[PDB]
Design a protein around this motif. Structure first.
Motif, PDB file in Angstrom:
ATOM      1  N   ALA A  29     -55.429  60.907   0.384  1.00  0.00           N
ATOM      2  CA  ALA A  29     -54.716  59.948   0.855  1.00  0.00           C
ATOM      3  C   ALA A  29     -55.651  58.553   0.485  1.00  0.00           C
ATOM      4  CB  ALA A  29     -54.686  60.031   2.417  1.00  0.00           C
ATOM      5  N   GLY A  30     -56.365  58.285  -0.306  1.00  0.00           N
ATOM      6  CA  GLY A  30     -56.924  57.199  -0.939  1.00  0.00           C
ATOM      7  C   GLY A  30     -58.331  57.115  -0.472  1.00  0.00           C
ATOM      8  N   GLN A  31     -58.896  58.231   0.236  1.00  0.00           N
ATOM      9  CA  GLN A  31     -60.417  58.059   0.558  1.00  0.00           C
ATOM     10  C   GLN A  31     -61.182  57.558  -0.370  1.00  0.00           C
ATOM     11  OE1 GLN A  31     -61.910  61.420   2.477  1.00  0.00           O
ATOM     12  NE2 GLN A  31     -59.977  62.377   1.813  1.00  0.00           N
ATOM     13  N   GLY A  32     -62.369  56.794  -0.336  1.00  0.00           N
ATOM     14  CA  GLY A  32     -63.067  56.477  -1.382  1.00  0.00           C
ATOM     15  C   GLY A  32     -62.863  55.323  -2.093  1.00  0.00           C
ATOM     16  N   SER A  33     -61.235  54.951  -1.880  1.00  0.00           N
ATOM     17  CA  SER A  33     -61.061  53.743  -2.411  1.00  0.00           C
ATOM     18  C   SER A  33     -61.166  52.410  -1.673  1.00  0.00           C
ATOM     19  CB  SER A  33     -59.616  53.805  -3.097  1.00  0.00           C
ATOM     20  OG  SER A  33     -58.691  53.910  -2.143  1.00  0.00           O
ATOM     21  N   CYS A  34     -60.876  51.265  -1.998  1.00  0.00           N
ATOM     22  CA  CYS A  34     -60.973  50.118  -1.285  1.00  0.00           C
ATOM     23  C   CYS A  34     -59.642  49.422  -1.865  1.00  0.00           C
ATOM     24  CB  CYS A  34     -62.348  49.300  -1.246  1.00  0.00           C
ATOM     25  SG  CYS A  34     -63.653  50.386  -0.745  1.00  0.00           S
TER      26      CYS A  34
END
Ligand code: CA
Ligand code: CA
Length: 279
Positions: A29-34
Motif C-alpha cells: 500500500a505505498g509504504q516507504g513512499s512519500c
C-alpha cells in the motif's frame, strides 16, 4: 488485499470494468513512499490518516486546512478508508489559502520547496507531488512543474475543469509532468474535465468520497479528485518497484485500461488509470 464496499473510484482503478465495489490492492500500500499534497493543507489529526500525515510548510498565517480541499485530496491519496496508497507518508504544503486560491508566485515557491525538502525526508521508495490546482497558462508555472519533475519527483497535476483543451492551463499544459483528466462511474469523461493532446491519463473524478475537515467525510467532483488517484497509484507502483518517479506517468499510461471511456474527443488519449492487481 481487498476493501469491500469501497468508494467507486478505488474499485474502478483495480478493475478492468466499471460497476464493481471492491478495491483490490497489494498490502504494501505505498509504504516507504512519500506524497506531497500541495494544496490548502491537510487536517493531519484526522483519524483516517492514522498519524501518517503532517504539515511541512505553509505560506500563510497557519498550517491548518480551513478549506477542506487539501484534506479531501490527501484522503484520496492515502487515507485508510478512502485512499489509493493506504500506507504512504503524506506531507502537506499549503500554497492555497482557506478559500482555495493562491498566487502563482507562492505556488511556484511551494514546488521549489518540495524539490529541496524531499532531500531531508526519508522516502526510500520515491517521492510524488500531487497538484490539484491550476489556472491560466503561465510559462513560469510550467517551468516550476518541470523543475520539480526534473528534480526526481513524480508530478501529477489536474487537467482542469473547464471542459476545454488543457493546453491553455498551467501546470496542466507542461508536457513533462503527468496531466490527469476525470471520468465518472459509468466510464464517461466527466462533463467538466478538460481534454486535449497534453492529457496523459484519466482517473475517477466524479462523486468521489474522501476525508474532510472537522474529522468528517464528503463527496465532491473535479479533476482535483482524479489527480490524487493517479498520484496515489504512482506512490503505490513505486513502492512496488514497477516504475520510478521519472517514468511513472508513462508506465501508468502503458498499463492503463484502453478505450473504455466514452465522450473522449479525437486527439485525446482514452486511457484510464489501472493498478493491474492480481491476487
Ligand atoms: Ca474494459
Ligand atoms: Ca505529460
Amino acid at each position: 488485499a481487498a476493501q469491500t464496499n469501497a468508494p467507486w473510484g478505488l474499485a474502478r482503478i483495480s478493475s478492468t470494468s466499471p460497476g464493481t465495489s471492491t478495491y483490490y490492492y497489494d498490502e504494501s500500500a505505498g509504504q516507504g513512499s512519500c506524497v506531497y499534497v500541495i494544496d490548502t493543507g491537510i487536517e493531519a489529526s484526522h483519524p483516517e490518516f492514522e498519524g501518517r500525515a503532517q504539515m511541512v510548510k505553509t505560506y500563510y498565517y497557519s498550517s491548518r486546512d480551513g478549506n477542506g480541499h487539501g484534506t479531501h485530496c490527501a484522503g484520496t491519496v492515502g487515507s485508510r478508508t478512502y485512499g489509493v496508497a493506504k500506507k504512504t507518508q503524506l506531507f502537506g504544503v499549503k500554497v492555497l489559502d482557506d478559500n482555495g486560491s493562491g498566487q502563482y508566485s507562492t505556488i511556484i515557491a511551494g514546488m521549489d520547496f518540495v524539490a529541496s525538502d524531499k532531500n531531508n525526508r526519508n522516502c526510500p521508495k520515491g517521492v510524488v507531488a500531487s497538484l490539484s490546482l491550476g489556472g491560466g497558462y503561465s510559462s513560469s508555472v510550467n517551468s516550476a512543474a518541470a523543475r520539480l519533475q526534473s528534480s526526481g519527483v513524480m508530478v501529477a497535476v489536474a487537467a482542469g475543469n473547464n471542459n476545454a483543451d488543457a493546453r491553455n492551463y498551467s501546470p496542466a499544459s507542461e508536457p513533462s509532468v503527468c496531466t490527469v483528466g476525470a471520468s465518472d462511474r459509468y466510464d464517461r469523461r466527466s462533463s467538466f474535465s478538460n481534454y486535449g493532446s497534453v492529457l496523459d491519463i484519466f482517473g475517477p473524478g466524479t462523486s468521489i468520497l474522501s476525508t474532510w475537515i472537522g474529522g468528517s467525510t464528503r463527496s465532491i467532483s473535479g479533476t482535483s479528485m482524479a489527480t490524487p488517484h493517479v498520484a496515489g497509484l504512482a506512490a503505490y507502483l513505486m513502492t512496488l518497484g514497477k516504475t520510478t518517479a521519472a517514468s511513472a506517468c508513462r508506465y501508468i499510461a502503458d498499463t492503463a485500461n484502453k478505450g473504455d471511456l466514452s465522450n473522449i474527443p479525437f486527439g485525446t488519449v482514452n486511457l484510464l488509470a489501472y493498478n493491474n492487481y492480481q491476487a
